Ligand binder design. Structure first.
Ligand SMILES: Clc1ccc(OCc2nnn[nH]2)cc1Cl
Ligand code: NA
Ligand SMILES: [Zn+2]
Length: 256
């Protein structure tokens, strides 16, 4: 599977029939229809003790991985019950600044989207968590092109060392707090992974406020390769799934 004409999102259902399921992601967020939920508790992003380890090009995106063997960096509150441990983050992005995000906001596409992936510690390990309807919480953050994001630059600068599929590099002492916007206002809904296996195991928390990154920063994302070393070059761009049918779901807002 991938993102090309011959193996992309319109093909995925043949090996992963849940691609046409009842709670697939991403979705369009219609801001006029999303409703404030006074019931949501405050969102708690607790990343002070986050321990990054490594950055990996897996042929689909690049992943920054964390030590999740203890409750270091966790996401709690909001729509969530219990404690979700940060395991990794990655992005999806476009070939052009007008596309690249997976979620859309009133059909608007952002240049990219950051996903911080967390798993529900009541299920003991990540593999067990993805088999549960409330196994994962993904914090989604839009990127728009404007001023540079200082906290992203250490990521940008290491991409030259993981150009191709299968390459990894040490990536210790990175603080993911530098990737967040000022506001934690969010939308939330029940959904799925946005790549195969497309499991319906995600509580989505999508921040309303985008972060700005510079044109130079996202240009360096676009120099990555889907291919492995020694293979014909396939630029890693447009690694996003389009919006899926909302079906029997309501998107809730944390804010008035
Ligand atoms: Cl660990 C991980 C890495 C990448 C990935 O991409 C698809 C995606 N993004 N947000 N939800 N699913 C999924 C996961 Cl669960
Ligand atoms: Na759920
Ligand atoms: Zn993602």
């Amino acid at each position: 599977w991938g993102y090309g004409k011959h193996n992309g999102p319109e093909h995925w259902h043949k090996d992963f029939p849940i691609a046409k399921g009842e709670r697939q992601s991403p979705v369009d967020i219609d801001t006029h229809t999303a409703k404030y939920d006074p019931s949501l508790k405050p969102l708690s992003v607790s990343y002070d003790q986050a321990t990054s380890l490594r950055i990996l090009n897996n042929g689909h995106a690049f992943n920054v991985e964390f030590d999740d063997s203890q409750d270091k960096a966790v996401l709690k509150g909001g729509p969530l019950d219990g404690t979700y441990r940060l395991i990794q983050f990655h992005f999806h992005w476009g070939s052009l600044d007008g596309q690249g995000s997976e979620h859309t906001v009133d059909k608007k596409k952002y240049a990219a989207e950051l996903h911080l992936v967390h798993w529900n510690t009541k299920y003991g390990d990540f593999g067990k968590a993805v088999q549960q309807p409330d196994g994962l919480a993904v914090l989604g953050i839009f990127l728009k092109v404007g001023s540079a994001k200082p906290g992203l630059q250490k990521v940008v600068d290491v991409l030259d060392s993981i150009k191709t599929k299968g390459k990894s590099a040490d990536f210790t002492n990175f603080d993911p707090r530098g990737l967040l916007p000022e506001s934690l206002d969010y939308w939330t809904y029940p959904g799925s992974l946005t790549t195969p296996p497309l499991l319906e195991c995600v509580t989505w928390i999508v921040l309303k406020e985008p972060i700005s990154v510079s044109s130079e920063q996202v240009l360096k994302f676009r120099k990555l390769n889907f291919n492995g070393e020694g293979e014909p070059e396939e630029l890693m761009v447009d690694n996003w799934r389009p919006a899926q049918p909302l079906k029997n779901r309501q998107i809730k807002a944390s804010f008035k």
